Amino acid sequence: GSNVNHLIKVTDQSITEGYDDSDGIIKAHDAENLIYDVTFEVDDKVKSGDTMTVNIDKNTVPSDLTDSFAIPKIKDNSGEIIATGTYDNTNKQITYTFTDYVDKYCNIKAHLKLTSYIDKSKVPNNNTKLDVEYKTALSSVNKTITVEYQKPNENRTANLQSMFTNIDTKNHTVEQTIYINPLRYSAKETNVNISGNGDEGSTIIDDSTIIKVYKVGDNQNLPDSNRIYDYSEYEDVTNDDYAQLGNNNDVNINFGNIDSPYIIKVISKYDPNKDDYTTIQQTVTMQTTINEYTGEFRTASYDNTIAFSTSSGQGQGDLC
CATH class of the missing domain: 2.60.40.1290 (Immunoglobulin-like)
Incomplete structure (x- = not known):
């Protein structure tokens, strides 16, 4: 059971605002979330027990209303769980650990649509420019947005x-x-x-x-x-x-x-x-x-x- 980020090949990522009418601006007070979409391949070599990582931006939290947030389990239309994940709030990092699944299937691939919100503890002032950064394994992508209250x-x-x-x-x-x-x-x-x-x-x-x-x-x-x-x-x-x-x-x-x-x-x-x-x-x-x-x-x-x-x-x- 080891970290397999190097065996993960991200084919497409994207940061997105949950609202089609406020670009570059997040209406933190209108529940406008940030959206991280990522697709990646998982080498056949990865095995049950291995782990991988996904980073949401340092100034965001998986939810702006709770704390006990679950990370979506990675499943396929089959119902089998491919990987489950925990979240570390000090580093704003998710850690997925694969299941039996990676030992049974080949040419594996998955997609994540991770929703996120501005961590007010880190951003308490109106009009706070930020360079948010999302990352899956070794591939990151950036965007510039301004928080508004x-x-x-x-x-x-x-x-x-x-x-x-x-x-x-x-x-x-x-x-x-x-x-x-x-x-x-x-x-x-x-x-x-x-x-x-x-x-x-x-x-x-x-x-x-x-x-x-x-x-x-x-x-x-x-x-x-x-x-x-x-x-x-x-x-x-x-x-x-x-x-x-x-x-x-x-x-x-x-x-x-x-x-x-x-x-x-x-x-x-x-x-x-x-x-x-x-x-x-x-x-x-x-x-x-x-x-x-x-x-x-x-x-x-x-x-x-x-x-x-x-x-x-x-x-x-x-x-x-």
Whole structure:
């Protein structure tokens, strides 16, 4: 069992954006993934137990919503598994190890369509030019792309932005990181209503929802990636006496008069057994009173929608 990269002949690779209308730009906040397509031959000499490698770009992860990601097993229309693979996140490398298969078939060949996303931990700033590099064995291919993030939606003092940062499909939960008042306006009587009522899907807002609120210090860092990797850096201001569930699968949060931005970390659950409007969706709305003489107020909204892309590997061969 040894590394057989030298016995692997890549016949065609290609890096691709998952969206046909943003070239050179990845809408990291629109779930635009990167696509790595590669085809390669596997020498007859390779044997059951041997391993090979595939490198996704250093600034990307197999998924932008989980961690426990599987690498597509390499199979053929026959059902037999040709090779399975593990993934090392420190180096962003996949390692496929061949099965009995390479001892039974000859003139073997396979193709991979590996999907990937921008690793926000490595790219937290809007407009970050990168030279991504994908590689299968000894053949690599490059591309130049610019990462772009969302801007906050606003109206008078109301202004926010959200993004899903994690999903537990095994336990039916989703993490939404919300930025309340990122523009530092003086927001009077701010109220944030979080809802499981989406127009295309939903989540469940109830007494099992975990809500964490943090205050962003004066000129403290607020990554355009819209994902917080180490919450310990911020002043925790949670206070459930200010969070009252609503009458409509929602929750209200009284922030009173604020001048700083806050981060709201929400963990909610979803029902995986719907027959329609099956998409996981959650909508945040920020309300503020913009007139002390009229009691009049303005809103700003932001919603999110779980969106993924799957990877895969097909192969084939001739009996020896």
